[model samples]
Target: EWQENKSWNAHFTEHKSQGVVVLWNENKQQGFTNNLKRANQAFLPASTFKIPNSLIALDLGVVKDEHQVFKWDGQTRDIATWNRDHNLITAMKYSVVPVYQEFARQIGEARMSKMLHAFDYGNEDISGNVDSFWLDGGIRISATEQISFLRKLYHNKLHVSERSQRIVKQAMLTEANGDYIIRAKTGYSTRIEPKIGWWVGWVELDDNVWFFAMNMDMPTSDGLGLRQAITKEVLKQEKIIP
Candidate 1:
């Protein structure tokens, strides 16, 4: 954990939700995190689970690439976006639960466990439900671990093949502003009670890589996106981006 970057105090006034930001700059081997202690508290990964899920799918050949298609199951659902067929890229873009849920089913329990350990993912406990492991299931991960794993991801040090890492990173691209590229994921877990939100990813500056993971208690669904809101500002405060 590193010293608090007080410039982020603005977010405290903007959002009342209790949140934490943990970050690492690969070039300097340094970090600055707010709520550093709580950053170590484990929580469900929710949709952010898609980050590693996408990698697992790619490594096992569960799908070919961003172009592999998953036809909708045709069951009526509440979210209209998830009701249609989707490939890796679109599924990830929409954070389509059913699309990746099917990916888990095909990947199976045994392989999932093996690969999770191989990937050294959080807890790696797909003990309860197969499809929703990263949701409210057995697996849990702290912001600290999220940063660690993401560091491994950025370095291509995870057990996954180089191609899997490359393709998955391509799929997670949020956007780019000429010189700055951000590859990240957001996770909002409202499954139980008292919702929680997460934003975990890294910013690729011209020559430096900054990894971040943020989560906070949400009083309402409207607060779900705050995870990213807080992170971007902090990155800017650190002068890591525009």
Candidate 2:
């Protein structure tokens, strides 16, 4: 899932990035970079918030299933994939804004604020606007916090209904092969000057689960993919998937 499929060692370069991986075991073995302090800094969760939103949407019955349909307005929007109707799964795949905005509205400001506190997600703030807190400046979560949240989810520890957990985890699946299945989300806060990129989730290995969160400055939109690039490199080196 992290694409240890190449000679990955050659792709690394130094940058202002930070990553943390916590193994889902009793000891919670971890690996990280020199900039653990940076990883500790809270920043916007961006679309990564979709992971929890997915859960909340289902938990609260905002949508019934992966097939729950959302019709699109005809307005020409920023992201093209959002131009038409979408179901829960499709919105997640494309990170569709309006589709999720509908979900946010349905979930409501009052309930959404409660949801954040329940998840202990991103400083637990949804102040500025209920619909856009994660994408806006209202909330923040550190890389370590990301890993901890993911770890809780991976083991089915959150207080959410079991069906919601199962379906949300299913929606997060990115790849699978003989030995591992990857569950992840990528996020970018374009509102930030040098946009912050994020790739966060985990791989379920034969014997363990490895949860990770990576984020860094992307000098251009083209650099957004590097969040996964650097993270895959580190995961590769640790034999987490390779």
Candidate 3:
């Protein structure tokens, strides 16, 4: 069952950003959603696709393992961290597009497309340049779909191998504590008009896990951080985090 969590409204309103949050708790067998309609609406996945992309790269044996170094081309990009070489964990940590793009090129379009279909990811459309598809490609996923996909990954229920899933989860870890762990990824679609921002992942506490997916309209770059800001606020209000 799902509940409309209106208490989360003020967080978005405060940021002046229209957004939706979908949370599914495994233990309670309950779901919480704000703006159910928007939650069901699909939007560009942006960097959030990295989650599945990482899994595919690992599953296909494209690279040796998470520690395999993807050498930098010495071509500096916007992000300072991306200017140097990176392993899968560091690449995911910085949301490094160049490294993932290189991974896609090596993985090839046919294999990448097949994997997405197997994973039932978003529209499963990796149309456009093989490297840039998820960045500004035809792939679109709703917050609801994001939650579903995430829950599958959380349980190693996706088509990918369990080893693949485990490695990706390790890369997704954002924070950790004695009693709880937060694993997530943030994404932004600057190329699209009225850009979209995403902060999607799950929280594990005790023996239970809560998965969440949030996407918001980013009218300006200033609203970028609001993706995680609003999410954290809602989590706090629900006492999912302290």
Candidate 4:
């Protein structure tokens, strides 16, 4: 299902100043790394943290199903207006801040902190609510940690029950086209001094699982602009899909 493509290397050189790309295969227990040094550095996960949050919520029975609905405050909220809708699944898909914050409030700081620690998120201690700027005092993680944690989630090794893990995984996976599966999420924040862009997720190809996480800082206009193109090229070159 995989094919080689050169576009990735071109972008690698173009964005040489900052950024990294990481991919892991769950079935083969194999992975690839480019800019390994940068990838190994710790950085804020942005919305990529939602995956873990979703897992915690589901495991604790915070929400019923993806379709379960909640009301929107309709106030000028976070960077994105998508946050108005309170549905857990829609909030996830839309990357809504308020909805996520609401869930975080429900989970509470202590419980969320416990889950983050249990999952071995970052080295620092996590406290306060999800919307807190420093749940773990500016949560940070290296690409290696990101990929490792993703693999564990794929293998149900995150201490989460098998059923609960399965539910989270199912919610995360998205169908793109043909038989291709594109399970992903995107995030950005202008509040930070330089602003951050993020895209992290996984794809399933012929029984093989590929997980990826990439983050960078760019001008507000160029936020996450290169992610889809780069990832598609990587998939082609790595022979993960046709």
lDDT for each candidate structure? 0.84, 0.76, 0.88, 0.68
lDDT of 1 by residue, 116-195 (tens): 89877888888778998787688888898899998888889999898999887888799799868999888888885447
lDDT of 2 by residue, 100-199 (tens): 7788889998888887788887798886766787887578888878887887787788778888898988889888999788889988888755468888
**Candidate 2, superposed: residue stretches over 4 Å from native:** 1-28
Clashes of 4: 8
- Is candidate 2 or 4 superior in lDDT? 2
lDDT of 1 at 239: 83
Error of 3 at 76 (Å): 1.7
The candidate maximizing lDDT is: 3
Query: Which residue pairs clash within candidate 1?
Result: none
The total number of steric clashes, by the backbone 3 Å criterion, in model 1 comes to 0
Judged by TM-score, which candidate is best?
3
Clashes of each: 0, 0, 0, 8
Q: Report the Cα lDDT for residue 109, model 2.
A: 85
What TM-score number comes out for model 4? 0.84
Candidate 2 vs 3: which has more lDDT: 3
